[PDB]
Write an enzyme that holds these catalytic residues in place. Sequence first.
Site, PDB file in Angstrom:
ATOM      1  NE  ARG A  18      43.093  55.629  22.489  1.00 38.37           N
ATOM      2  CZ  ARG A  18      42.429  55.830  23.649  1.00 38.37           C
ATOM      3  NH1 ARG A  18      41.814  54.826  24.263  1.00 38.37           N
ATOM      4  NH2 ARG A  18      42.397  57.053  24.202  1.00 38.37           N
ATOM      5  CG  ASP A  60      41.595  68.667  25.123  1.00 46.44           C
ATOM      6  OD1 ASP A  60      40.586  68.906  25.748  1.00 46.44           O
ATOM      7  OD2 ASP A  60      42.413  67.805  25.521  1.00 46.44           O
ATOM      8  CE1 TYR A  62      46.903  66.446  24.272  1.00 44.29           C
ATOM      9  CE2 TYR A  62      45.721  67.768  25.925  1.00 44.29           C
ATOM     10  CZ  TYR A  62      45.729  66.967  24.792  1.00 44.29           C
ATOM     11  OH  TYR A  62      44.532  66.657  24.241  1.00 44.29           O
TER      12      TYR A  62
HETATM   13  N1  LIG Z   1      40.493  60.307  23.788  1.00 45.06           N
HETATM   14  C1  LIG Z   1      39.905  61.433  24.315  1.00 45.06           C
HETATM   15  O1  LIG Z   1      39.122  61.397  25.262  1.00 45.06           O
HETATM   16  C2  LIG Z   1      40.224  62.803  23.769  1.00 45.06           C
HETATM   17  C3  LIG Z   1      39.895  63.945  24.518  1.00 45.06           C
HETATM   18  C4  LIG Z   1      40.314  65.212  23.995  1.00 45.06           C
HETATM   19  C5  LIG Z   1      40.988  65.291  22.767  1.00 45.06           C
HETATM   20  N2  LIG Z   1      41.279  64.141  22.103  1.00 45.06           N
HETATM   21  C6  LIG Z   1      41.981  64.259  20.853  1.00 45.06           C
HETATM   22  O2  LIG Z   1      41.381  63.363  19.902  1.00 45.06           O
HETATM   23  C7  LIG Z   1      42.430  62.821  19.079  1.00 45.06           C
HETATM   24  C8  LIG Z   1      42.280  61.271  19.060  1.00 45.06           C
HETATM   25  O3  LIG Z   1      42.333  60.876  20.453  1.00 45.06           O
HETATM   26  P1  LIG Z   1      42.778  59.334  20.748  1.00 45.06           P
HETATM   27  O4  LIG Z   1      42.469  58.989  22.206  1.00 45.06           O
HETATM   28  O5  LIG Z   1      42.290  58.409  19.614  1.00 45.06           O
HETATM   29  O6  LIG Z   1      44.374  59.516  20.614  1.00 45.06           O
HETATM   30  P2  LIG Z   1      45.561  58.540  21.177  1.00 45.06           P
HETATM   31  O7  LIG Z   1      44.961  57.154  21.108  1.00 45.06           O
HETATM   32  O8  LIG Z   1      46.060  59.167  22.417  1.00 45.06           O
HETATM   33  O9  LIG Z   1      46.593  58.762  19.937  1.00 45.06           O
HETATM   34  C9  LIG Z   1      46.187  58.404  18.629  1.00 45.06           C
HETATM   35  C10 LIG Z   1      47.452  58.012  17.826  1.00 45.06           C
HETATM   36  O10 LIG Z   1      48.425  59.037  17.870  1.00 45.06           O
HETATM   37  C11 LIG Z   1      49.634  58.568  17.313  1.00 45.06           C
HETATM   38  N3  LIG Z   1      50.849  59.146  17.939  1.00 45.06           N
HETATM   39  C12 LIG Z   1      51.230  59.301  19.245  1.00 45.06           C
HETATM   40  N4  LIG Z   1      52.541  59.785  19.317  1.00 45.06           N
HETATM   41  C13 LIG Z   1      52.944  59.888  17.986  1.00 45.06           C
HETATM   42  C14 LIG Z   1      54.215  60.237  17.226  1.00 45.06           C
HETATM   43  N5  LIG Z   1      55.255  60.672  17.959  1.00 45.06           N
HETATM   44  N6  LIG Z   1      54.273  60.147  15.865  1.00 45.06           N
HETATM   45  C15 LIG Z   1      53.153  59.792  15.138  1.00 45.06           C
HETATM   46  N7  LIG Z   1      51.969  59.386  15.720  1.00 45.06           N
HETATM   47  C16 LIG Z   1      51.851  59.435  17.106  1.00 45.06           C
HETATM   48  C17 LIG Z   1      49.657  57.069  17.735  1.00 45.06           C
HETATM   49  O11 LIG Z   1      49.839  56.156  16.628  1.00 45.06           O
HETATM   50  P3  LIG Z   1      50.572  54.677  16.829  1.00 45.06           P
HETATM   51  O12 LIG Z   1      49.608  53.976  17.804  1.00 45.06           O
HETATM   52  O13 LIG Z   1      50.599  54.209  15.388  1.00 45.06           O
HETATM   53  O14 LIG Z   1      51.923  54.791  17.463  1.00 45.06           O
HETATM   54  C18 LIG Z   1      48.304  56.893  18.447  1.00 45.06           C
HETATM   55  O15 LIG Z   1      47.637  55.618  18.268  1.00 45.06           O
HETATM   56  C19 LIG Z   1      43.794  63.248  19.614  1.00 45.06           C
HETATM   57  O16 LIG Z   1      44.259  64.378  18.817  1.00 45.06           O
HETATM   58  C20 LIG Z   1      43.397  63.704  21.003  1.00 45.06           C
HETATM   59  O17 LIG Z   1      44.279  64.598  21.645  1.00 45.06           O
HETATM   60  C21 LIG Z   1      40.955  62.887  22.594  1.00 45.06           C
END
Ligand SMILES: NC(=O)c1ccc[n+]([C@@H]2O[C@H](COP(=O)([O-])OP(=O)(O)OC[C@H]3O[C@@H](n4cnc5c(N)ncnc54)[C@H](OP(=O)(O)O)[C@@H]3O)[C@@H](O)[C@H]2O)c1
Lengths: 248, 248, 249, 248
Positions: A13, A141, A154
């Site tokens: 991702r 975010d 969150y």
């Molecule tokens: N996706 C969006 O639309 C969006 C919107 C707003 C903000 N964001 C921010 O952008 C960033 C990336 O988003 P994303 O969608 O790529 O994130 P995600 O897929 O929700 O999480 C990314 C990685 O976080 C790690 N994670 C979760 N719980 C954890 C724990 N307890 N210990 C260590 N690692 C942990 C996981 O690694 P493993 O898979 O190795 O377990 C997961 O693959 C995040 O900070 C997110 O909040 C995203």
Amino acid sequence: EAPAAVVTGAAKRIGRAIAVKLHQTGYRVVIHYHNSAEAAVSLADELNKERSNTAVVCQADLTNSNVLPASCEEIINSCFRAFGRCDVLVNNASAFYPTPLVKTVETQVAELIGTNAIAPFLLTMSFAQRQSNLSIVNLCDAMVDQPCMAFSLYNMGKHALVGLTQSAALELAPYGIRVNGVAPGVSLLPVAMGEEEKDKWRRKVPLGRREASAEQIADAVIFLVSGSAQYITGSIIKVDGGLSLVHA
Amino acid sequence: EAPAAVVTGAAKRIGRAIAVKLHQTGYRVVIHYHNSAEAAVSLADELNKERSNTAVVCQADLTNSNVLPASCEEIINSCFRAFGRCDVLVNNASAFYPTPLVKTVETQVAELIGTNAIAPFLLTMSFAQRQSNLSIVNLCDAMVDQPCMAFSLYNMGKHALVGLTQSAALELAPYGIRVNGVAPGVSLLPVAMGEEEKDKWRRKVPLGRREASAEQIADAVIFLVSGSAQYITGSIIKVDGGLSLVHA
Amino acid sequence: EAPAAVVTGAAKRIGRAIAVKLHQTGYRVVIHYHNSAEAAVSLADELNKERSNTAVVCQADLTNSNVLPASCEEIINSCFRAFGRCDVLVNNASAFYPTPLVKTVETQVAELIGTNAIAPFLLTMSFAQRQKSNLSIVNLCDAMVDQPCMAFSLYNMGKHALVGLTQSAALELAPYGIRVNGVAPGVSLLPVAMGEEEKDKWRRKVPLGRREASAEQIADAVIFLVSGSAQYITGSIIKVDGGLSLVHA
Amino acid sequence: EAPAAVVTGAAKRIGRAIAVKLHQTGYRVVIHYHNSAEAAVSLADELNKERSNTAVVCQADLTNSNVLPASCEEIINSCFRAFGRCDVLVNNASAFYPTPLVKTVETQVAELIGTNAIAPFLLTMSFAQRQSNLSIVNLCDAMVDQPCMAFSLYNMGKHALVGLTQSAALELAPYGIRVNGVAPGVSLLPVAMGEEEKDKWRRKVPLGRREASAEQIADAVIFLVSGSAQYITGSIIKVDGGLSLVHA
Ligand SMILES: NC(=O)c1ccc[n+]([C@@H]2O[C@H](COP(=O)([O-])OP(=O)(O)OC[C@H]3O[C@@H](n4cnc5c(N)ncnc54)[C@H](OP(=O)(O)O)[C@@H]3O)[C@@H](O)[C@H]2O)c1
Ligand SMILES: NC(=O)c1ccc[n+]([C@@H]2O[C@H](COP(=O)([O-])OP(=O)(O)OC[C@H]3O[C@@H](n4cnc5c(N)ncnc54)[C@H](OP(=O)(O)O)[C@@H]3O)[C@@H](O)[C@H]2O)c1
Ligand SMILES: NC(=O)c1ccc[n+]([C@@H]2O[C@H](COP(=O)([O-])OP(=O)(O)OC[C@H]3O[C@@H](n4cnc5c(N)ncnc54)[C@H](OP(=O)(O)O)[C@@H]3O)[C@@H](O)[C@H]2O)c1
Ligand SMILES: NC(=O)c1ccc[n+]([C@@H]2O[C@H](COP(=O)([O-])OP(=O)(O)OC[C@H]3O[C@@H](n4cnc5c(N)ncnc54)[C@H](OP(=O)(O)O)[C@@H]3O)[C@@H](O)[C@H]2O)c1
Ligand SMILES: COC(=O)C1CCN(C(=O)c2ccc(CSc3ccc4nc(N)sc4c3)cc2)CC1
């Protein structure tokens, strides 16, 4: 020699897109992961095939506990043991799920506050203590002030992370370390979400009615770590296609 | 009969001024305390002398731990047991001290994030679950965006508290519960800090070069709990004499 | 075909560094100026020596008046008449001086609010009317707008208005594929007047390096926003301020 | 004697509720109006019926022009002429209509930027130049960061008015003048609006699915001019039922 970056939650991702784009710019990368071990090792292999000895993995649970500080110490240590230096920390790993006000609550706090705020704090402490263009980029975010219903812990975590961004930019600037954030709106939607629900989110985005690509998020990280952002610290750049400007 | 309020950290300084003024406006009050038993009871005695059986005390440590949830439940229950209702929660209790990025760190986390953010969140859940002019007021900080140097966990905790204010305002509005903040600038100086360090601060304030009294803070609290603030929720009222407008 | 950009107040300082870096990136440029003719021509000649027929100058006063709409339309037109397109608008020109609450006051209003806010709105209307593709607008904002200098109320009002425009234009032009963003310097090139000892009071307050941003540092953020690397970014204001705005009194 | 207040655009709707409530609190009022001469004279009659000699009207177009400064000076002078003092200025008058990017545009700018920002500045200058609890309250807009599509000049005006609130709070604080804002979300809906569109807006408000009454807006105004807000300057109170916290 090549600089080195740690990216947290880099197996898939947005974290993956960021480690890959950093790697394409010339960095050596620590791919941190928690549960996604196959995905992490596979990414490190692709990157090492492109340039050898330039990618390692590092497993760590970033849930808050009395050993989180040691785990954050060891992530940073892993970059120094592999590459001899650590230039860039991207705090990308995040837990994300509803915690309605009306898993034990203490586990929810540990995971949502730990991964989204406390681990970025402890990693920022370790990154600075273990010390050219040093910076930290925090994934924030863009909708923190217009929160989704029933996501208080969150939202708390991402607000704390804005505080860390500002406070660490202030305190680390004298050491030449910049700290900034990148704030997606809707980017890659959650794996478990149905297409119908994904399209309701897409339709809200003024610029294109679609979510950001992982690469679009990685581009802004790449900018903030580059010499084109050398005077920027304490800034959070929204990458949200205008979503945060849309009224109810 | 009369409405009842809970005020956390109510034994001294700002929380005492809030307790007094709520009591003066006709609320019955639970004075929460952690270490200040003597001071809490002495306040309850003064209030019960004014009107009998209108003030009780409640001891709890608000440090984050596996038991904070039970303690937060107990604080809210103690209002219901004493008075048969709980109309107002004032999250006033707060730890404050520096945590330089360059007490164990997990103890500083437990105090600065636990009491400043997690206990308000747990108190908010218990208050809402146990349910009119219902409202919660969180004691925020007007300088959250221009933080004191080396106060990163404190700053993280107060940013989390802004997140809680907004998320809880949205989520509890359907239940008629308003959630608001009051953000002091320099008020009553930390009892430790000397009189030379304290007058430096006083001279920076636009409005009269003096700190806020505790009662000025309590005045904004009283407004937000009143019938005059019935459409206000998710608002944070700064009470800082203009300090946060002053550039570096 | 090379894209084309209008930069307002481009003859000197920050707007000059913006025009140069856009030109280095492959843009044709309109160098708008008010009083600085010699500096604007000299920049257009340097740029044309690097690549023929890539820079023109355009004179206009951006003070608020009955004629400002026509002037702003003429600036945008000059880019289309010179280059046959207008991809990028950088609203950089700004009046800046103190207006204590306690030149006539209506002149102060016309100049501070016209150059900082109304001229950008009018240029933005003229830029979008002529389009209807990496089209974008970048407004030069001010990182210290919520911690304003004493006795700068009209300047502060003008720059907050500009934030509003940035947000409102981002939302309204996003369906035409036009992005609108800002760059907010803290302390950059200091006023030409100012003694080194006063400039040093400012430099000492910046956490990152205890120095002002160069014009080029501000231009770099502009380049990022107009680039293909910022294709999803609209409505955003990037502070380029060395951490200045985080420093309490 | 009794303190005096100027309220701009005080003949109808929210400015009228503000004038009524100030008057009910003991103030003498200048009711400024532009076109609503009948409603202004009728409110001043009603107030004077209740306490003689406590209300006057003052007519003035607040559109930007080279004579706006003289008109603003006249509004302040009229309060001094009627009552011998001017303790409170409320900047409530406002033009509001769409100005799509894609009447002449010079007239749109003059009316939307004049009434919402330039007239407040000039009134603030005249108020301060003519000078124990002095204060100014600006009617701002809770939705200024999530604007209505096609309202750029209105939104620019309302942003400018936040800048004016901050800059004038800082510069006037040494004269004992406090400056603050009150930011409605949806309150009295425009007369022109159909009832179906009115209801779409009501359903967006988290606290009650209803618009604010004018009296609820006036309540916050009363608070900021009162003795209970004497340390509050540069603050803007949202009175929006949670509307600005709701995502798209
Ligand atoms: N996706 C969006 O639309 C969006 C919107 C707003 C903000 N964001 C921010 O952008 C960033 C990336 O988003 P994303 O969608 O790529 O994130 P995600 O897929 O929700 O999480 C990314 C990685 O976080 C790690 N994670 C979760 N719980 C954890 C724990 N307890 N210990 C260590 N690692 C942990 C996981 O690694 P493993 O898979 O190795 O377990 C997961 O693959 C995040 O900070 C997110 O909040 C995203
Ligand atoms: N004073 C200022 O100038 C200022 C400035 C900015 C923000 N604020 C905010 O205004 C609020 C009240 O300020 P204040 O100066 O009156 O606060 P304070 O004196 O620092 O603390 C208030 C109360 O919090 C309680 N507390 C501290 N740690 C605790 C723990 N681990 N468990 C349980 N209770 C604990 C204490 O209760 P016991 O004494 O019973 O142990 C104390 O009496 C705070 O939320 C603060 O962040 C104040
Ligand atoms: N320098 C800083 O530290 C700093 C800090 C915060 C924000 N900013 C913002 O960054 C931008 C560039 O800053 P700067 O220091 O380079 O600007 P500046 O030197 O103060 O002004 C830029 C140009 O604005 C043009 N201008 C002024 N009044 C005008 C009028 N009535 N009509 C038309 N043009 C007019 C002038 O053109 P002519 O010379 O051709 O007359 C001037 O050269 C501005 O928007 C400024 O507000 C700068
Ligand atoms: N109503 C809401 O939902 C809402 C929401 C957000 C913010 N607000 C803000 O709250 C304040 C009061 O709201 P409202 O709905 O009561 O306002 P409104 O009915 O739209 O306007 C108030 C008065 O402003 C005066 N005005 C308009 N153009 C003027 C000019 N050129 N010169 C002098 N006066 C002029 C008019 O006076 P005459 O009638 O005498 O001509 C009008 O009655 C406004 O600043 C508004 O922007 C309202
Ligand atoms: C006068 O122009 C018209 O007759 C039409 C009615 C309004 N229109 C709308 O889309 C529209 C947009 C937003 C709101 C939110 S409530 C508000 C906000 C600030 C404000 N500011 C004021 N001065 S009253 C006011 C009222 C209501 C309606 C379309 C055009």
